[PDB]
Design a protein around this ligand. Structure first.
Ligand SMILES: CC(=O)N[C@@H](CCN(CC(=O)O)Cc1ccccc1)C(=O)N[C@H](C)C(=O)NO
Ligand SMILES: [Zn+2]
Length: 255
């Protein structure tokens, strides 16, 4: 199989006698195929930055093992050359501390795996607008990726209502350094949606939210370039191309 860096893949496996799916010594969770009772599904994602060139997963059954080989593709992302090397930068200590704290917090949240669906059918876009800055635009130095856009931005004037892309539970609902005012929803199965730069947060941590329910108003908080909604999906432990992910997910779960 082949998969573009920065994307998720829904792997389909026989259910009967299945024991475990492994990537070296890391276990990858599974969940039911909603249509085919003889199958299960796993999400496998490649990171945008520094992905392996190749991956081998093994599905262990009671009677045998199944190898699955996935070749990393570079895809056709937009990229621009950096003029100055992305060397160590020197933020104020107060900012270093905040960043480190929020990273620890988020790493913890993304680690607390929910082994059931909290979604309700297909994902919907969070507002009926258009993309102004796509996922995966990159900046390179010496042809190596230095940084990339980890979500997709939708055009929005400040104060535009934003709606949950699917049902779930709110895990994050505060102001953060990279993200500004942000909401993160757990949808189950290690799938999280992210809504950044809000001017107003309308939910709280722990709240059950329905698909299409208001979560906030769009803004420019924490944004250098002007008001817009930054939308992200984390799945399989990695930030992945959100519209690509929704397309894949909806192909399986929309009915
Ligand atoms: C670390 C950092 O400074 N993040 C900034 C800016 C740009 N990101 C970096 C990234 O991966 O988080 C690179 C970048 C962006 C665009 C093109 C090339 C590189 C930020 O506001 N991110 C939010 C999520 C966003 O993206 N809003 O729109
Ligand atoms: Zn963005």
């Amino acid at each position: 199989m082949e998969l573009i860096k920065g994307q998720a893949l829904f792997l389909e496996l026989d259910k009967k006698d299945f024991l475990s799916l492994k990537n070296n010594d890391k276990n990858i969770p599974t969940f039911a195929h909603p249509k085919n009772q003889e199958k299960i599904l796993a999400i496998f994602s490649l990171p945008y930055k520094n992905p392996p060139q190749n991956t081998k997963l093994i599905a262990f059954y009671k009677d045998k093992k199944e190898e699955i080989f996935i070749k990393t593709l570079e895809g056709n992302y937009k990229s621009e050359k950096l003029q100055v090397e992305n060397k160590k930068i020197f933020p104020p200590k107060t900012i270093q501390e905040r960043i480190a704290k929020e990273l620890k917090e988020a790493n913890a949240i993304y680690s607390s795996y929910t082994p059931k669906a909290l979604f309700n059918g297909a994902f919907n876009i969070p507002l009926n607008s258009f993309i102004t800055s796509d996922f995966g635009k990159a900046r390179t130095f010496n042809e190596k990726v230095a940084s990339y856009h980890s979500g997709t931005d939708f055009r929005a004037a400040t104060g535009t209502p934003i709606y949950a892309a699917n049902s779930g539970v709110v895990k994050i609902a505060k102001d953060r350094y990279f993200a500004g005012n942000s909401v993160v929803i757990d949808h189950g199965f290690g799938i999280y949606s992210q809504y950044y730069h809000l001017s107003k947060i309308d939910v709280k941590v722990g709240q059950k939210i329905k698909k299409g329910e208001l979560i906030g108003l769009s803004g420019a908080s924490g944004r250098v370039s002007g008001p817009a909604l930054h939308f992200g999906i984390l799945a399989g432990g990695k930030q992945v191309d959100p519209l690509d992910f929704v397309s894949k997910f909806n192909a399986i779960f929309q009915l």
